Amino acid sequence: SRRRQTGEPPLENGLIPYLGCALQFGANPLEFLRANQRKHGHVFTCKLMGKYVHFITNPLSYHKVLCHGKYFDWKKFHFALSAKAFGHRSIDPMDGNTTENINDTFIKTLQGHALNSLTESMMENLQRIMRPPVSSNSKTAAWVTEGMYSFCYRVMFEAGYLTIFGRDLTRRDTQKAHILNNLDNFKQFDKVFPALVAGLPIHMFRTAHNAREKLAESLRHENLQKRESISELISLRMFLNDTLSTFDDLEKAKTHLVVLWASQANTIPATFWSLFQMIRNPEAMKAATEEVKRTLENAGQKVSLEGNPICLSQAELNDLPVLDSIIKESLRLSSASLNIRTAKEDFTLHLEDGSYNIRKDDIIALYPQLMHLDPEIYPDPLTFKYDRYLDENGKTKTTFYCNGLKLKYYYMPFGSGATICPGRLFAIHEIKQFLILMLSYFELELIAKCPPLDQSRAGLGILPPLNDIEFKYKFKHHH
Amino acid sequence: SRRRQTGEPPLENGLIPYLGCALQFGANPLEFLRANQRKHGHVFTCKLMGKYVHFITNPLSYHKVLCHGKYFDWKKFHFALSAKAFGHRSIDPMDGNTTENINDTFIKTLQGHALNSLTESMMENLQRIMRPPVAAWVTEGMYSFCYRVMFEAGYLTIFGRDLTRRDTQKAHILNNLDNFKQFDKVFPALVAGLPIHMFRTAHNAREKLAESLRHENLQKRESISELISLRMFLNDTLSTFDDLEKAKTHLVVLWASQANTIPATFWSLFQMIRNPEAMKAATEEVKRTLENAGQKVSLPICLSQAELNDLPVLDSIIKESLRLSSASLNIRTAKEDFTLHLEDGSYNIRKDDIIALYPQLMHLDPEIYPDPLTFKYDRYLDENGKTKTTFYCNGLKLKYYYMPFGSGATICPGRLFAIHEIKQFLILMLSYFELELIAKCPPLDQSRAGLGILPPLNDIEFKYKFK
Ligand code: HEM
Ligand code: HEM
Ligand SMILES: CC(C)CCC[C@@H](C)[C@H]1CC[C@H]2[C@@H]3C(=O)C=C4C[C@@H](O)CC[C@]4(C)[C@H]3CC[C@]12C
């Protein structure tokens, strides 16, 4: 059994399978980490996910781990997690199944030119999905009540699925069927994801296991080749699977399920929280409505449920500081990411207050929700302030302080440094696009107090609400 | 990682913290083990509770692990579990903090003469609690009712009574009860190796319980069980435990005496009232025994040891209740690498591996117990109305067919006392109250899979009125 040696952080006893475990027995991961801070100070070690994880919780020390460092491996743990949760052989190029640099693939196809086409495609897809079936106005005249999470889930999943994996236009009559099946199968697989990253076998979850494998079946190359308007990301990944890997057909299908998960698992809860917080807070709703109305006015874009679609420029979509602030403030409150790297050798990590001996293969982790909810940095941290990331000029605020010192890293739901989401710009675009179309197509009302976060997914990104909340919507801008 | 070697059972990949985990993600421990049985056959290995656990699921092979064997250590895992969950240094005499043989201590003080005085004391304590204060219906949750009655009675029987301040004892009892609920709630997690400081309320509850069981506080009490009196003595003369650790050893015994008894009592009561035929048979049996014993009920019943034991209808109701609700893990640890020879196969076992039975698989086997999910109150009654002991698997008569208390060396030392206390409770319920449900049968809560008698996922309400 492991014993603390001199210079190593305080070592907590106990085995924690995963961060969101045991909520039914009264666990609370945020409060658990905060209790460890009070007990041990800003650095402490836990046995978590079968590793020894050093938590660095001083915001002033984040820069020392988020920089590139000779002793940091920022891919090892993620590679192992993917192989384990999705079921494929090692994608670590050291293990010889592939020579692809996947970071390079993502950056090339989610940023730059590729981001522009993705963004246009998402906007077309969102409009096809959110617009009512071309029929009488009486069909869409009344208020409709639905769970908001459930609504966001189906719109964003379908739009995101078709944007990333293209569309099958050979059989249009059955695509509602296939999408609903894919949607249901993804819900069932993602449900058990916290357990899978803990090392629990997917065999323990029969329906989830079946769902994962049916999803993989739909993403076999033979099936993707039937589709049109496929993202450059998946086109390239198909090509690099074929030319740079020795993966079998199923494993190639699994690599696309990985990307499906990556594109959906955070975006869906992010969209929910942004919509909810916007509707819940009258000032936010008012500010967002005016910003979007003005942008569409200035861009000469008419809103209609049928006919001409909205086409915004890349600058018009990016220069939406009120929507940006609403999204950032929604993620500040809901984000529960683990930012990780693995010690390449024994070394001493030099931080703000102290220096700490780290062993080879130990994990050095940040849990930035601790910073996001820190009242020293964000006064009234549990309050949604739609303008929290707006300065006096109504532009995006970038000045935040801890102990009077200006923070470089103050907002981290996408990570930072090398450990950062390559899809972040596309994510912000798709949420903005969703919000724009919601404000433009619908009148919107709640029926609802703010649900707590579901911490069973602690470490996996944006936390969903513990329970859905009902809202009502009604189409506007009819003929 | 571990690789399955030649001759070893099929090895399931993955890591299972504890058997009742991940229910919120759709896990089902019983169906998981059954699925593995279909997939792999009667023997398979899982990484469970940080060990490599070989499940032996053939009822015809149980006898080969329930015998004393050169390679079976049947104490190591339990010792390690107690230290972890309750917080004390090793009680393994090999580790040098005690020379007590705790198994001997329990047998000496829970069986024989000691059993007779425990049983007499439990009846007095139950009657003290259940009697009317010195004509309305009361509606209550049945589990909640069984909990408070059996906890109080069992606590006072095992740990005695503080008679110096009678005026505050209901307050002290209610605090102990609340604290025990909060501690026991997280028990499944603790046996997985999760730290108790992950559960602030439960941690505080465990230590407040320990505080009340310090020797200084036990010495204030009277009519203490011989079990706790001897345990106190052996703490002092045979161990080098500190005061807190000595208190924790008594908390261990409090848990042992309560955590299975309470759910057992709920199920026996619930199944008896729910099933008219069972209620009629139990009522007639108790009536006849009390009449033949010259015992009249009123606002002290003194049954002989023979009179309490010879209650086959009540015995059958309790057995059939535990057959349905029991989720025990019967465990031993391999002392060395060896080949285990079972009915159909031989399997290589590594030193420090666990060899496990999960008897719920047998209890709910339709080959052994036809219509296994139906409560049949007379399932353990033969044609003569005596306790039935003849059960078959593939036509072969089973030695081990009813295992909620374990079997062999790995058997609950309090089992006889346990059956007495549930019988006494049922006797008093039938004798003192009119009883009505307000209720379809709750499913079992499998979060406690491995820990004994599973409670219902939800309580059910019932009414009771003093006769
Ligand atoms: C609100 C939406 C999203 C949030 C909060 C989010 C958050 C994250 C976080 C925290 C990581 C891990 C960063 C690290 O510590 O290394 C990550 C990785 C990743 N994300 Fe996102 N993400 C979002 C949307 C998307 C979208 C729409 C895509 C579309 C393809 C995407 C693709 C990825 C990929 C491919 C990785 C792994 C990169 C690698 O391992 O090289 N994400 N995301
Ligand atoms: C329905 C009631 C009860 C059930 C179902 C039950 C069940 C069990 C089971 C399955 C074991 C583990 C046996 C093994 O596999 O090694 C056990 C151990 C034990 N039980 Fe019980 N029990 C019950 C009542 C009691 C009561 C009332 C006491 C009172 C003191 C008690 C004291 C113990 C002790 C001390 C051990 C550990 C023995 C040792 O480690 O040497 N039990 N029980
Ligand atoms: C098969 C290959 C072509 C692709 C492999 C890419 C794998 C390694 C990438 C793709 C998406 C990535 C996850 C992600 O999107 C978000 C988070 C949130 C953060 O809090 C914890 C890490 C986590 C779960 C990432 C883990 C690594 C993943 C699975």
Ligand SMILES: CC(C)CCC[C@@H](C)[C@H]1CC[C@H]2[C@@H]3C(=O)C=C4C[C@@H](O)CC[C@]4(C)[C@H]3CC[C@]12C
């Ligand atoms: C401190 C010492 C004086 C006493 C130590 C005794 C410890 C080792 C004894 C006392 C009570 C025993 C538990 C028990 O009652 C019932 C079960 C159910 C079974 O399904 C799994 C094992 C389990 C949890 C036993 C584990 C070992 C325990 C804690």
